[PDB]
């Protein structure tokens, strides 16, 4: 045997770090069955951009999960880790307006000056200035410093000039690690080792992460650049994220709203809004799509009802909305620290479950309630108010769901609810689950048709549907009625109505699977 | 999402029929003697003769 | 002549519907076997086998002639025949040769590569479709030679013991 | 009907170059025997074999249900059949009357001559595809004349012990 090092250079080699006393290891997975949404508050991101998140990504994007001491500040990461699990999806994080993102000029001599500037600003250069370098990611470099570091190269094969950028990134112990390196210059017609292109503005937005710059065409010609030690970002700062007013919310809503990315479920990440929320509504009923939302949790139970009907949701208009209350307590995974949270993205795990059973439809006719779909995976629970009762009957005519413990041992979500006080067989959760899969296949059906020598027609329409009714009857989603003499065998009903040559109407009905949540024994004696 | 008691409304489209009148119209064949005429030429076109005897 | 004969295509057509609602059957000529440090062997392998998965079963008497039958511990052990392909440079030959030389144990690795799932020219398999087998041994049985046989070409026959299976 | 079909011909093409890749495939009408001192009876024979090249086993029930299969000591001595034409003078029944009469131990060497591996009118053969057989002993079975079967010539079956294999 021979010596061993700590830490790896260039040389071929093996080493090992020094022990670690306390550290965590996490392993992750990447499916894409089912891709949920949100909004939420977060530590460093690109704010009012789509980000799509991973279970291998979403420490990396978006970022350390935030201390629960600081306060109303850690729910969202939490959700976004349940929901995660099953399959990934997609962020918009709301940023308050007292943020700024840090930025270096740099002078024709080569000196720089430091200074931040508001996330809705854009740069502008000062004469005298030859280019700036800023963080594009949305990350302030307070409790992490970010240091810069400027040395020379050789020069390029056709007289270029050419210089090494390094970052690199500093704790608040001392300890020093290396991010990223490039090969920059400042000239507009230069080549890399590689063969690629060197200028720095192209370069940093094709190869980098991390960083953007911006140049003065005018005087970038005349421009000389010397060595520098590690320079430091600064004034890179986030207000008080605890405090976040309703046009930020709106703001990230309104561009969730427009997104390609096609969804199929809304998650409201511990965003306690009744603006934000109803909005959030209005994108699920325009989507055709399932919507799950959650009330205050520290809200006692004889309150909690009404704060149902402050927000909107409670009518005829938003379908398949579930709204959740969760007063209990548990011990939070990063820190032991018994935080408070709600149940969002619990709900949807149970629903993806549910759907990963079929592969041809999806099988959207499970309810997510249940002892086997809808488990509370948690450390210790305890009841914020105890020797207190709910009244279940109440509950249910205000369209609110429930927790149980199961015969395991664990939580589970007893119940399943739409927002929808009519009686109309629709606040069960699954019946307009199916209908909007149908609708989102025959939606896609009309698409591709149009591309046709005839284009849209009757009988076109019919033969389509027929194989999609067909497949949805073989799921197992669509039974036969109950009483055989009444109604007919056949599960669905798909017939056309002529009228006027210029009118026509297609209509099919369909007979939804029950669920059985009522049950009743009545023992005897001989 | 135009939802009204319990059945949906999804889409209108717009469609366009045919009826047929009798009437019918059809070319004559006199053209085609003139095309077989002019296009019997470039038979002849594109011959060269390199030395004249 | 029968009376109970009546014609019924929905229920036909509602059973095709459902069997054709799988994705796929699995042909039989699309398996890879791994050998784990010996790579190059994987090519020349013909036929392969996929272990029993089965328990020892116990058997008891009960009151009057009443009988059960109980589970019992996993059965590791086993055996599976593998035929190979011989080229003009006795690759197979060579390998065997090796194996009984040195007194070894490889991990062998089973898994099915449909054409219909695979990207580019690397083909991708399923958790699903993958069995694993540990600390076998590589035998040998006897190769037959013949004149008169101008259409066929050599294949050994090989037998693989397995100590445990996991996946 | 299958919606999980989708067609990928590259990685066909792939699978083909990699199995063209490795030279040929040994035809088995290709091989020849030497039988030691007695080199006279090569062109006869007719059909040959490779040793079973296999070890013995030990099982071991462990702990539970838990067993174990453990490499054991080599075997060396084996039958092979080989079959021989038969001529007008008795070559082969000569063979067998002398080998009979005298207690004798011949060795013989079983090997692969493909035709694109060769120059002049000279076989090569590769230390690869070369096995020996030592100390053997030749033995006959009943050799079957018959009426009837104008179209056959007799093809007396031996019977051949080896007792160490060398390569």
């Known amino acids: 045997q021979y010596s061993i090092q700590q830490s790896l250079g260039n040389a071929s080699g093996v080493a090992v770090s020094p022990i670690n006393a306390d550290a965590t290891l996490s392993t992750g997975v990447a499916l894409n069955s089912s891709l949920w949404a949100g909004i939420g508050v977060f530590a460093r991101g690109k704010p009012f951009t789509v980000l799509a998140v991973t279970e291998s990504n979403y420490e990396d994007v978006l970022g350390e999960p935030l201390k629960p001491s600081s306060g109303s500040q850690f729910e969202p990461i939490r959700h976004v880790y349940e929901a995660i699990q099953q399959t990934s999806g997609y962020v918009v994080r709301a940023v308050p307006d007292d943020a700024k993102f840090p930025i270096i000029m740099f002078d024709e001599s080569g000196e720089p000056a430091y200074s931040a500037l508001p996330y809705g600003s854009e740069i502008e250069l000062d004469s005298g200035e030859a280019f700036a370098i800023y963080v594009d990611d949305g990350d302030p470099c307070i409790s992490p410093t970010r240091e810069l570091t400027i040395e020379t190269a050789t020069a390029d094969s056709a007289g270029n000039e050419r210089f090494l950028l390094k970052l690199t990134q500093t704790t608040s112990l001392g300890v020093?690690?290396?991010?990223?390196?490039?090969?920059?210059?400042?000239?507009?017609?230069?080549?890399?080792?590689?063969?690629?292109?060197?200028?720095?503005?192209?370069?940093?937005?094709?190869?980098?992460?991390?960083?953007?710059?911006?140049?003065?065409?005018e005087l970038i010609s005349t421009a000389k650049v010397t060595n520098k030690k590690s320079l430091a970002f600064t004034g890179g700062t986030n207000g008080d994220q605890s405090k976040i007013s309703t046009a930020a919310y709106l703001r990230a809503v309104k561009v969730l709203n427009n997104a390609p990315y096609m969804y199929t479920a809304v998650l409201g990440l511990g965003c306690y809004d009744n603006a934000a929320i109803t909005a959030l509504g209005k994108i699920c009923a325009d989507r055709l799509i399932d919507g799950f939302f959650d009330v205050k949790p520290t809200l006692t139970y004889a309150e909690a009802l009404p704060a149902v009907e402050d927000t909107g949701l409670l009518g005829t208009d938003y379908v398949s909305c579930s709204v959740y209350h969760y007063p209990f307590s548990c011990k939070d995974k990063w820190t032991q620290s018994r935080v408070v949270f709600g149940l969002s993205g619990v709900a949807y795990a149970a629903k993806a479950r549910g759907v990963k059973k079929n592969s041809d439809v999806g099988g959207w006719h499970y309810s997510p309630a249940g002892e086997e779909r809808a488990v509370i995976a948690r450390a210790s629970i305890q009841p914020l108010y105890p020797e207190d009762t709910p009244d279940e009957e109440a509950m249910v005519k205000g369209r609110l769901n429930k927790v149980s413990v199961g015969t395991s041992g664990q939580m589970i979500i007893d119940d399943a609810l739409t927002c929808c006080t009519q009686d109309n067989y629709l606040h069960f959760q699954h019946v307009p689950s199916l209908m909007n899969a149908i609708s989102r296949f025959f939606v896609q059906l009309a698409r591709q048709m149009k591309h046709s020598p005839d284009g849209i027609t009757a009988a076109g329409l019919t033969k389509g549907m027929t194989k999609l009714l067909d497949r949805f009857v073989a799921s197992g989603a669509l039974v036969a009625p109950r009483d055989p003499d009444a109604d007919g065998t056949e599960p669905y009903v798909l017939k056309v109505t002529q009228a006027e040559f210029d009118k026509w109407e297609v209509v099919w009905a369909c007979c939804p699977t029950g669920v059985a949540r009522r049950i009743q024994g009545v023992p005897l004696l001989i | 999402m135009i939802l009204n008691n319990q059945e949906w409304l999804?889409?209108?489209?717009?469609?366009?029929?045919?009826?047929?009148?009798?009437?019918?119209?059809?070319?004559?064949?006199?053209?085609?003697?003139?095309?077989?005429?002019?296009?019997?030429?470039?038979?002849?076109?594109?011959?060269?003769?390199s030395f004249n005897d | 002549g029968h009376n109970n004969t009546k014609g019924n295509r929905k229920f036909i057509k509602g059973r095709y519907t459902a069997n054709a609602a799988k994705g796929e059957r699995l042909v039989s000529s699309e398996f890879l076997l791994?050998?784990?440090?010996?790579?190059?062997?994987?090519?020349?392998?013909?036929?392969?086998?996929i272990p029993e998965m089965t328990r020892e079963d116990v058997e008891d008497y009960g009151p009057n002639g009443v009988k059960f039958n109980q589970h019992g511990p996993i059965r590791n052990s086993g055996e599976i025949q593998v035929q190979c392909v011989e080229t003009i440079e006795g690759d197979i030959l060579q390998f065997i040769k090796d194996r009984i030389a040195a007194k070894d144990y490889v991990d062998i690795t089973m898994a099915a590569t449909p054409e219909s799932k695979s990207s580019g020219v690397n083909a991708v398999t399923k958790a699903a479709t993958t069995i694993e087998m540990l600390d076998c041994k590589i035998y040998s049985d006897a190769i037959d030679f013949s004149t008169e046989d101008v259409t066929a070409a050599v294949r050994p026959s090989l037998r693989i013991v397995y100590n445990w299976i996991e996946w």
């Open chain 1, 176 to 217: 020093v690690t290396t991010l990223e390196t490039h090969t920059v210059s400042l000239a507009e017609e230069a080549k890399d080792d590689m063969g690629r292109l060197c200028y720095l503005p192209t370069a940093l937005e094709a190869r980098s992460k991390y960083l953007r710059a911006v140049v003065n065409e």
């Open chain 2, 10 to 49: 999804l889409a209108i489209f717009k469609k366009k029929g045919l009826t047929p009148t009798g009437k019918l119209e059809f070319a004559t064949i006199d053209g085609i003697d003139s095309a077989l005429a002019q296009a019997l030429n470039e038979a002849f076109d594109s011959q060269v003769v």
């Open chain 3, 34 to 49: 791994t050998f784990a440090g010996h790579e190059d062997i994987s090519v020349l392998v013909r036929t392969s086998q």
